[PDB]
Structures are given as C-alpha cells and as structure tokens.
DNA sequence: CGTACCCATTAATGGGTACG
DNA sequence: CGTACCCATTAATGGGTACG
C-alpha cells in the first residue's frame, strides 16, 4: 500500500473519502462531475487493492496518511 | 454524540464497520443474517446522527471511540 | 432488545470507450 | 492524466411489521 503511487486527483478524492464524503459531495467540492469522481474512485481502489471506500477511509486513518 | 447511547449489538456493528467490513461480512463474523445487521446499522446511524457507514467509520477513528 | 423479514430507492462498484 | 460518459451489478439506505 503506497499512497505515492496514486495520482494527484486520486489523492484529492481519497482525502475527501477519508473525511466521509459520498461521491456527489466530492464532485461538488472539487467542482467536477460525479462521473469523474467515480472514475478516480475505482482507479484508486484498484491501485491500492482496497475492497471499498470504507476500507480506503479506515486505511487512511490507521496509517495516518495525509 | 455518545457511543454509550447505543445498545451492545449496535456497538458490535459499529466496531466492525470501523474496521471497514461490509454488512455481509459483519453478518458472518457475528453469526446473524445480513437482514439483522442492516437493522442494527440503520438504528445506529439514526441514533448517532451519522449519514452513512463511512461517517460512522471516520468518526470512530477521529474521536478514537474504541 | 435482538432477531429477521417486507417495501422502495439511492449509492457504490467495476468493466468499457473517448478525447484534449 | 483528467475529463465524462456508456454498460450492468451489488451494496447500502431508511421506512415498515413481526415475535420471543
């Protein structure tokens, strides 16, 4: 699990997920469509080998990433 | 937002959600049906004024509830 | 309280193509 | 890379009734 392997946008989304935001809120916060957020989300999830956004959030708080 | 306001089983579910498990896994870990797991999740979210299981997970880690 | 359904609806997952 | 859509599916939400 290496956070540096993600792209800037992917880290943007991961940070917001770790703050408990649903895809629609992330889209409004970053001012991009929900479609795009979802693309970043699945890319991040595949690269980090995480089963869901909840794992992503928990993982972020455990390894104190960001 | 007091964790003590929850029932024992509700805290069991919260703990497992904060460990990033989906309802189906929680059901197997607790040896109860997914149906019952969903009822506890639903009760817990309303009582704790959380909007999703992700907020529940982040909250637990931020306030170190457990 | 905990159990386990019923209902409907929305959110999220995970594969694809496309194009500056 | 980042954008934004296409597809289909599962996971999750949030009301309800029921019963030991």
Swiss-Prot record, chains A, B:
Q: What is this protein called?
A: Nitrate/nitrite response regulator protein NarL
- Which residue ranges carry the DNA-binding annotation? 23-42
Instruction: Please list the residue ranges annotated as the HTH luxR-type domain.
Output: 1-64
Q: Where are the transmembrane segments?
A: none
- Its function? This protein activates the expression of the nitrate reductase (narGHJI) and formate dehydrogenase-N (fdnGHI) operons and represses the transcription of the fumarate reductase (frdABCD) operon in response to a nitrate/nitrite induction signal transmitted by either the NarX or NarQ proteins.
């Amino acid at each position: 699990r290496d956070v540096n392997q993600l792209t800037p946008r992917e880290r943007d989304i991961l940070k917001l997920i770790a703050q408990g935001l649903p895809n629609k809120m992330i889209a409004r916060r970053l001012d991009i469509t929900e479609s795009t957020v979802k693309v970043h989300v699945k890319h991040m999830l595949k690269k980090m080998k995480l089963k869901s956004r909840v794992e992503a959030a928990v993982w972020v708080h455990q390894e104190r990433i960001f």
